[model samples]
Target: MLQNIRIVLVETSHTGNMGSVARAMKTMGLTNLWLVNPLVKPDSQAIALAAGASDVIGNAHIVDTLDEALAGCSLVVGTSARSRTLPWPMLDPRECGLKSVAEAANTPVALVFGRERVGLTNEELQKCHYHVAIAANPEYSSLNLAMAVQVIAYEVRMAWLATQTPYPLVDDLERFYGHLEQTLLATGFIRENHPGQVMNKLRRLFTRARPESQELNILRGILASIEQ
Candidate 1:
């Protein structure tokens, strides 16, 4: 069960921070770590920092892209600092943890964290099925990488210490989105020159409503009919 939960980090520069995150993740029984193009490769510093949890880093999967990290992951939740113009479906840390545990049974679940300094880029976060935010003191809200990892990882273990629903896989959702774009462009629904944010807005609302696999089955058929 814990093995299905993937802790993903993107562009983390500090090897020590990576090790710290590994320790935090292992403390919560999450052993899967995916590193996406870290600025520095994991080394002695990272292993030393991991302390007893060095195996988390030792067994970490290095990928070139976030999509690769998310491949085969059914539920992908990206941690964002706050609500932006995108305004994705939001989840608190507890909810995020619970959902991951529930969905992980059906398929792998990905929890994506970004660089310690800048957080995830907006578009990088756009790929997530949902966005999760920490409720921190507004005036002096600051959390380091390992601290944030600990909080979320703690919730995950709590929920585990506690699920039948099938949702779209990351692969399934991508095909849906691609077919949606092609149909929209070809069937006079939208133009190529100035497509605006139409498709993104559709995905935004879909994230909120969270279409089931069967729900998208109908939508995909609808898209196919238009092409026919």
Candidate 2:
């Protein structure tokens, strides 16, 4: 779902903002980015701001127009700073995130953001199927471009996780339990012949909170080093 979702930026004024957006997007497992004729060329400042997310910036799809960025997307959602008179469909950030994740499973989804000073114009907003706006304080609701992306991206990840069941393979989990038992016996935590409640308790603890692939590898690595 994350892979099928694309983040679109139109005429972004600052390259640094683009870098930060890449950083924010990657932190939430999003990688696809579309640059629609950004003003400033991505320079050292962009890379510096992106930090470890430089690959995201490097790999972004560069396009000439909003339609190009949204090519083949099944759903297009644009960010809006305020309410409007046209009665375009509206969604809060949470709804937008969940909707994006849900739609992205079967078809590509586009989440578009406009320039920093003025968000997507009416014409661009009309291009989107839905408009999403962040609820901010009325006094001073201004938010940085990256901050808005981070908020929306965070919600996206939260919604994306709801669609997943990422338990480790049963055989791998069994192997870990087996290796763990052997380690306990070798360490005298339990005797081989009279393995007491400790094994079952450990098994219950581990099984209740099953580790994923990388976590299982770390468990094995720890046991390997301990046995050495």
Error of 2 at 25 (Å): 0.4
Model 2 residue pairs with clashes: none
| TM-score for candidate 2 | 0.69
Give stretches of model 1 more than 4 Å off. Answer: 44-47, 163-228
lDDT of 2: 0.86
Lowest summed lDDT window (length 10), candidate 1: 44-53
Best-matching candidate per lDDT: 2
lDDT of 2 by residue, 90-172 (tens): 99999988999999999999999989988778888989999888999988685788888898899999999998976648899
lDDT of 1 at 80: 71
lDDT, residue 93, candidate 1? 94
Query: Candidate 1 on 1-228: residue-level lDDT in tens?
Result: 889999999999887798789889878889999999989888733424656567788788999999999999889999876757786899999999899999887789999998987889988899899988888888856588788899999999988889325554767777888898888889778898755589889878776676778988999999888777
